[PDB]
Design a protein around this ligand. Structure first.
Ligand SMILES: Nc1ncnc2c1ncn2[C@@H]1O[C@H](COP(=O)(O)OP(=O)(O)O)[C@@H](O)[C@H]1O
Ligand SMILES: Nc1ncnc2c1ncn2[C@@H]1O[C@H](COP(=O)(O)OP(=O)(O)O)[C@@H](O)[C@H]1O
Lengths: 760, 777
């Protein structure tokens, strides 16, 4: 009967480690101890046993286990905690603030492999944000697993390309019944309360519904709740956003710099959001730029309309905090008293924001104002039910405010030491009995009593039950008074238990508003983003981009939004004109000329325009952009990226290609660079910026339509960082080499070779 | 308003005034508290709850707490953030006991087992640089006087300190800018005679002539500042630091930062430890052994005699790897344990592990006893025995001691007559007072009656406020705001004294006898540290003896003129990471064959071949056996790797470093110089650089190019020759032979490789057409 209370629910998911209650020290057994002690080096022990075969043990002490949660969970392992197992922690299902990262989303994902493609579904437990997609090929699944980057990945038993999910943290093998399409529909439809999955536009996508269905059960089974925050699933269409492979996200340093850090990136410049849920939304937008023109226009309107009012809106938005992750704990019933105190504090800012946005003459602003609600009755409820600054946990007490419930206020008075009933009883009894010496008292000896002095004692009524005889007086008890003592002795207990019950009641009172509450969390997150982008555009001097109906980019005095911030010396803004009549530019000129910076700034201004933000330029006109491609074992990996561009670019794609042809012979390289420039020019007809050192490619504009020459000017070598019309005058390879420090005689002799080379 | 703060808040504010830029953890028995801006800074970096509690200077106090059992867990995060943390232990007796800093970490839970952790000090004079590093947990103290900015830059990259002490005056800020745990220190700490006085005194010498540093003031200045910093953080003596060691350039193979990264010595190009030379060679069984090898790898010795003894050891121990390794494992990191003995910070289990390490010494001595080799019998001698200290620890501590001495119960019974008697009168102390709480609460039943201990009160009993009425009269109230009222029992306050005094005797005496173990061990520290040094090296050589066995390695041969004569040589990392066999290759370099022009296809093996040459050189120059059938290696002053700002700019800067500092004793590896510029300007540079290293520098050069025009250099020069990598075409697909043959590359395979990478057939069909057209003109 000892061991039979921990394996009760472990039989369902056997990979889960269990911190068992044993001698006020969280322990483990049956090879769970082997890992706990394997990747942590902690004390491997044995427990007393005489059944004929040995018992394995490995432990840790109480209030010295929270640091072992985050370590094992960030490692990729799951942890259950027996007390009853009142907590299961899995890498993709963490709802607690301490384990999560404030400005990074955390995902649970499930992958599937059908006889016509894959099934991929993702969920954030702390948002309720549920997505699904149908990648038909390995290369797209690779790009999806790299972008979503789940902390916990569910895969079927029969999964075929386990190479895609090899060497991954938080991996989970699952039986085929979890993925069954018929039951997945039943599960999902009922989770969203629907007859068909149309309206979410996922009904006709069965590969992804399997992965959705498996995941939904794995979330329910580990979080043991209704999961009310998960009310919808959404397919992400490629046409709906700007496609970018993992290479482009890396070369454009969107949220991560080339060295792994976060410093000196597009997000480090634009992300000045005042809430964690805002920061998270902004980073999401940067990685998924929208192709919807109206969403983008409503986004610019909010930026322009709220620019003057940032100073008043941001300190208020700061006070809202991460309502999103607070509501997730309300949905999972895990919400601590401080979560509810902070939710009230967020609610106390909605009148301010509503009053502030009231006169803003903008339909999308007025739309955010409505969506963010006010929740007048819910604010009042939390003001009345919780104390101003409550404790971290419920159990000790002191959470429920005085005045919310009279029985609590009553119970608390007996626990504090209120003697009002005793004063009332005393007057009643004295007047009732007509004995002036009658007094109500208490001693450890006989408890609560009615004392009558010897001289009146013999006239004590027949209902008085004597307990003590002193020389001066006698002391009695009555049913009424016995009943009061019992209440006084159970006071703290009853009050502590009632607090707990009234605390639960609040969840019941709050949850039927979760939908409206989730829209408010979203409205306020988004508000913080566009108010951030409003302030950024003013401070970092940005203009509103213009949308045109054909492939093309027209940038006037454009800048690199990160380089301009990093540099001490001023940024030299440059123009660009890409149109259906001028599609490809052969960018020539010296090293440190500004070729890379010019190409990347084009991709970032394009990206920013496609997040609804104002851009770093005097003026921008941009057409549809379906994809941003950068090509900016060396030759082999450059050609792999090149083949990706040639196989997937369209007339709506932006192609940035730097020095293609390097890493091979001059002839082979030139041949290859020419072939590629030719293909992207006359066959693909993408918006190409093609940086080269082969001055032979400068003959292409003379040879074909849509191609033209530009160069980075350099002046005895001074880099001017200005893009000019025409092919570059000469080669500064020897001058740059001289500046890098290459010996005089080495440069002098290389100049002699140069004479001989151009003299043949 | 200082005067408006509470008696202990003023004390905190007085202690926080001592070091205004470091977080002060203030002990409050159970917890470590941080206040105000410190509490705000610790709530964010440690992700702990911040609560505005109490009152001080007319306002609530922003507070943040840390449990005592979890202090090490939280300290570990701060030191990983490059942060220093002061530890604090009307009122009386509260001072900063220790100053936890990234470069002075001596505790196991805060250090990486297989990684070295250094505190450094940098100096800049009108005549040059002065550098000094200390590993506090071994006593390893080194100093150098760099000249080049490049020399200083590679030294900082090689040592990569956890903490960098730079003077106020320091000029080239760009050298150390934005690094981890930088510590700007006043110019006086770096004073020459003060540095000489403090260093000589520290090693008990007349002058510093015997360390070879007496003549190096730039280095001595940085070493001096550093020494007083280490002294001031620890707040006690450093007996383990008894020598300073000059690091000259002629002693080791010079490797600039770019070369260390390109050869993936200990860290690969992605930052990971996976697929490194260290990852293949480091199978040592003790942490001290892992760190020594990592050290050896980064600083290959140039001393012929040292290298010969290392090969000798490896050769003589090859057959005893299986016998010595399990015993050597038992020794553990005695080196780090010994430094914790020096700082008197060694916990009971550090002494347990010390006693277990001692138990292995006669066995390791037994095995090595008949090994017929001078460096082996030398390592055997240095290893020591310490039967005297083994018996002492065996008598003083129990089989498995607890983590702390705070609660006590570690000094084994029968070791002290006074302690045995005092503990017997302490076993009946946690008997009667425990049995008291049950019988009293059974006699007067209350749902909330708890017992609490205080330093000034003794033992208190606390009950509910409503329940307080029914509290006994044989109880004496000492009421407080929290909870209800907490009383003391006069009936049993005489027994309270007799128990807390008895426990207070047997615990203060236990700590007295334990403090005495340090006093009994410390006069042997030098001999113990020599023993830890031998045991770590024996681990490194037995490891290298095992690797040479398993990975099939041969002993390299040392020649007198520059040269590398490799027979059936292989890349030690690539051969392990591959499923298919590695095609072994021959290299031949000499004064009459200084430079090779490596021609051949892409993905052919040009890059791997060049990198295997440097690795075989390094491996030979650490004393190891090499991945080859035979190797003859001449002296190597420096290894330069230009293999794999702008792409062109960094390549040109690396080239500039090679041309300016490479000599006839240098091994220079260069992969396609001239890329990132025009075909003519590129060719002009590649030709010029090759012509300079062949004719003027005369370095041992491996020069891989796609400029087939350079295959003409052997026709026009001495000591220059052609080599190529072969491949075969199957009409369409190409199979790479990975074999180094003499002569130039027959053809260029760019179009074939680009088609292998998936470039559209039509695009290759057009690339061929342009090519046909180009080959004709
Ligand atoms: N327009 C500009 N204004 C100011 N500084 C610039 C500009 N463009 C580039 N720079 C600076 O000079 C460097 C030039 O390098 P880069 O653009 O990478 O040239 P390339 O690819 O031709 O070698 C940049 O990293 C940046 O520091
Ligand atoms: N001798 C060898 N035996 C087996 N594989 C080899 C050998 N030399 C190189 N390789 C493999 O060939 C591939 C390409 O080698 P590499 O040196 O990078 O080519 P390149 O000639 O372009 O510089 C790598 O995967 C490497 O592991």
């Amino acid at each position: 009967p000892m061991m039979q209370q921990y394996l009760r629910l472990k039989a369902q998911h056997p990979e889960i480690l269990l911190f068992y209650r044993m001698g006020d020290f969280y322990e483990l057994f049956y090879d769970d101890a082997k890992r706990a002690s394997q990747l942590l080096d902690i004390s491997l022990t044995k427990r007393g046993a005489s059944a004929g075969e040995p018992i394995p043990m490995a432990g840790i002490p109480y209030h010295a286990v929270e640091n072992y949660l985050a370590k094992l969970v960030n490692q990729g392992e799951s942890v259950a905690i027996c007390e009853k197992v009142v907590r299961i922690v899995t890498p993709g299902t963490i709802s607690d603030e301490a384990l999560l990262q404030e400005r990074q989303d955390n995902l649970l994902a499930a992958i599937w492999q059908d006889s016509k493609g894959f099934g991929y579904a993702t969920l954030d437990i702390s948002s309720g944000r549920f997505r699904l997609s149908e990648p038909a090929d390995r290369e797209t699944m690779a790009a999806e697993l790299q972008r979503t980057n789940p902390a916990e990945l569910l895969y079927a038993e029969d999964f075929a390309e386990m190479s895609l999910i090899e060497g991954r943290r938080g991996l989970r093998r699952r039986p085929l019944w979890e993925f069954e399409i018929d039951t997945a529909r039943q599960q999902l439809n009922l989770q969203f309360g629907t007859r068909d999955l149309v309206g979410f536009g996922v009904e006709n996508a069965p590969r992804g519904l399997c992965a959705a269905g498996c995941l939904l059960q794995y979330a329910k089974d580990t979080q043991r709740t209704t999961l009310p925050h998960i009310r919808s699933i959404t397919m992400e269409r490629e046409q709906d956003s700007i496609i970018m492979d993992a290479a482009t996200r890396r070369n454009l340093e969107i949220t991560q710099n080339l060295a792994g850090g976060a410093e000196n990136t597009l997000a480090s410049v634009l992300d000045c959001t005042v809430t964690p849920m805002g920061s998270r939304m902004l980073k999401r937008w940067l990685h998924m730029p929208v192709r919807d023109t109206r969403v983008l226009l409503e986004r610019q309107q909010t930026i322009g309309a709220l620019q003057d009012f940032t100073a008043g809106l941001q300190p208020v938005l700061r006070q809202v905090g991460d309502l999103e992750r607070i509501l997730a704990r309300l949905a999972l019933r895990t919400a601590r008293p401080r979560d509810l105190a902070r939710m009230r504090h967020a609610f106390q800012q909605l009148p301010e924001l509503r009053a502030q946005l009231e006169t803003v003459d903008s339909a999308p602003v007025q739309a955010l104002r409505e969506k963010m609600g006010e929740f007048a009755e819910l604010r009042d409820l939390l003001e009345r039910a919780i104390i101003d600054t409550p404790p971290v946990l419920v159990r000790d007490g002191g959470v429920i405010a005085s005045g919310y419930n009279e029985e609590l206020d009553e119970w608390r008075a007996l626990a504090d030491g209120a003697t009002d009933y005793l004063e009332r009883l005393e007057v009643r009894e004295r007047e009732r009995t007509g004995l002036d010496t009658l007094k109500v008292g208490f001693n450890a000896v006989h408890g609560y009593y009615i004392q009558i002095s010897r001289g009146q004692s013999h006239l004590a009524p027949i209902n008085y039950m004597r307990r003590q005889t002193l020389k001066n007086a006698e002391r009695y008890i009555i049913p009424e008074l016995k009943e009061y003592e019992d209440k006084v002795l159970t006071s703290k207990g009853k009050a502590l238990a009632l607090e707990k019950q009234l605390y639960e009641e609040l969840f019941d009172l709050l949850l039927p508003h979760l939908e409206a509450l989730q829209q408010s969390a979203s409205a306020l997150a988004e508000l913080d983003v566009l108010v951030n982008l409003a302030e950024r555009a003013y401070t970092l001097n940005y203009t509103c981009p213009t949308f045109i109906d054909k492939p093309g980019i027209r940038i006037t005095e454009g800048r690199h939004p990160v380089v301009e911030q990093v540099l001490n010396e001023p940024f030299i803004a440059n123009p660009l004109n890409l149109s259906p009549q001028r599609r490809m530019l052969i960018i020539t000129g010296p090293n440190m000329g500004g070729k890379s910076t010019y190409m990347r700034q084009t991709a970032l201004i394009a990206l920013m325009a496609y997040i609804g933000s104002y851009v770093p330029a005097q003026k921008v006109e941009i057409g549809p952009i379906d994809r941003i491609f950068t090509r900016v074992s060396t030759f082999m990996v450059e050609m792999t990226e090149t083949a990706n561009i040639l196989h997937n670019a369209t007339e709506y794609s932006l192609v940035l290609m730097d020095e293609i042809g390097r890493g091979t012979s001059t002839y082979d390289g030139l041949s290859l660079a020419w072939a590629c420039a030719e293909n992207l020019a006359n066959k693909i007809k993408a918006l190409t910026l093609f940086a080269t050192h082969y001055f032979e490619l400068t003959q292409l504009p003379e040879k074909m339509e849509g191609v033209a020459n530009v160069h980075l000017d350099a002046l005895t070598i001074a880099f001017m960082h200005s893009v000019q019309d025409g092919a570059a005058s000469k080669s500064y390879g020897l001058a740059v080499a001289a500046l890098a420090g290459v010996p005089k005689e080495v440069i002098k002799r290389a100049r002699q070779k140069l004479r001989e080379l151009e003299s043949i």
